[PDB]
Design a protein around this ligand. Structure first.
Ligand SMILES: Nc1ccc(S(=O)(=O)Nc2ccccn2)cc1
Ligand SMILES: Nc1ccc(S(=O)(=O)Nc2ccccn2)cc1
Lengths: 304, 304
């Protein structure tokens, strides 16, 4: 019993973190096989970041200008290429600690673990969600760029995020491991405003199921609703519209608890209209939306 | 910028987890040098747990009755001893992945990371606090016993917790790595009620400083207070009394922000008396108490 915001064990990713320095800029890289992946803005001065031409800046860089350090050992750079917003540095040594891995581009509302790093050294691990506006709400100081987000399926690490930017509003933007930004963001120090940070409805419903499984039941009510009726309420409260795909995904949690998905929607509708009245659910005074239905099943079933 | 509930990177502890089986009971053990540490209730049937005589049960066990598996390799048990509520199994092989480590007994209000494990396999990592009633609020299913709590100082793991029990109220109890329970709890399936779960005042104050550093400032007010006046309010709201030792510990955060500790106490006093009025601080609708002053400094300074 109990339900916690839980990250994946980080060891498999710790084994992949290195320091990348280009001139006076240091950040983190990800070493998988004989390639190190890092943000292309490693090549920028803070002055360059205001208006960078990355192809033109990169022409002034050679393999020997990229200093890659794995613990206290230097790696030899034998090639470099830019793919979208990431640099790929080819090194002469395969990472001996390379785990089984994939690169995946996640959808908004999907959760992942971040291993925050500075100078190639892990400092902490926490759980994030890709927000519906394609920002994340992380914890990143200067030097954290190139820290990665990931999920683990048994022994296979799926890398989904690399940290690139902090927006003027103090939320975070980055890329998949192909170097494509999530959302409309660019690796330039310019005005970039975020869209509406809507609540991830299917994740709130998952977390209410987690609450029932763990004995927090006060919010269960005598009502039901329809997807259309629920969605009028979601729209009013800046919640993502609920689709039949989301209802299907919540099927296992419905079956386990015996609470029909549309009944839990009616409980959520009442919570939106009435508030928490100073009560808590799983130690929260607000409706938590950074657990996916898969997260709730995993944590409630003890998957390793 | 941003502030997250952050766990320590778990790799150094993942390298220490093993499976311990005695008869039909399987749980987790911690392998450090040539010793495996696990809960002594590994020797109990569920029937035994109602009223166990551990010395008498242990007489019926030999070294060969303790099956220790490290990944898919069996370790040879060459001795066993009971120390308080933990078994120490001496094996013939030192763990090659043994990190620098210490055993520490933490004080209530101190935070630590838990690596939740099943069958010796890590499933997740999250951040806990030793509550003032000597419970923790974890996420532990059947098979999680012997999962450990720890802090890391650079390269040295300080182990502070091993999981033993779930109370009938669904909160958690365990031991330090000398096998001494935190609080009054025992490794028996009997009525054990928890005392008041008071709020860890010094940690709330730390988190309000974290909020100011990260730009959440709406709760700062025009008032100050005294320790005695603040403490009358703390008592009313089931908060731990604030001591001059706590004021001293918050000194660096006071200095960084320029907000005198007693001024932040007066902001906290108003929040207790007035509530949040539907507002949030660092994405929370309640006052968070599972960050220590050291946690806030570490996360805000990027210590690796
Ligand atoms: N929000 C935002 C998005 C893209 C860019 S740009 O660096 O592509 N530069 C551009 C884009 C359009 C017009 C002029 N410069 C800058 C800001
Ligand atoms: N809450 C609590 C604490 C200790 C015990 S005991 O297993 O030590 N057994 C005892 C203790 C006192 C009287 C009888 N049995 C049981 C319950």
């Amino acid at each position: 019993s109990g339900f916690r915001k839980m990250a994946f064990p980080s060891g498999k990713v710790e084994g992949c973190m290195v320091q990348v320095t280009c001139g006076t800029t240091t950040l983190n890289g990800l070493w998988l096989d004989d390639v190190v992946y890092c943000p292309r803005h490693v090549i920028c001065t803070s002055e360059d970041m205001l208006n960078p031409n990355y192809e033109d800046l990169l022409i002034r860089k050679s393999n020997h200008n990229f200093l890659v350090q794995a613990g206290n050992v230097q790696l030899r750079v034998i090639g470099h290429s830019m793919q979208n917003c990431v640099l790929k540095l080819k090194v002469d040594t395969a990472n001996p600690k390379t785990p089984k891995y994939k690169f995946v581009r996640i959808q908004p509302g999907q959760t992942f673990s971040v291993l925050a790093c500075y100078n190639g050294s892990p400092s902490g691990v926490y759980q994030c969600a890709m927000r519906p506006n394609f920002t994340i709400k992380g914890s990143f100081l200067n030097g954290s760029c190139g820290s990665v987000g990931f999920n683990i399926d048994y022994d296979c690490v799926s890398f989904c995020y690399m940290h690139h930017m902090e927006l003027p509003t103090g939320v975070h933007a980055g890329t998949d491991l192909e170097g494509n930004f999530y959302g409309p963001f660019v690796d330039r120090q310019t005005a970039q405003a975020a869209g509406t940070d809507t609540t991830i409805t299917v994740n709130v419903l998952a977390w209410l199921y987690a609450a029932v499984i763990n004995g927090d039941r006060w919010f269960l009510n005598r009502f039901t609703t329809t997807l259309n009726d629920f969605n009028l309420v979601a729209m009013k409260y800046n919640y993502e519209p609920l689709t039949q795909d989301h209802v299907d995904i919540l099927g296992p949690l419905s079956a386990q608890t015996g609470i029909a998905v549309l009944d839990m929607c009616a409980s959520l509708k009442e919570l939106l209209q009435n508030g928490m009245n100073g009560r808590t659910i799983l130690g929260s005074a607000l409706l938590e939306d950074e657990f996916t239905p898969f997260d709730v099943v995993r944590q409630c079933s003890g998957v390793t």
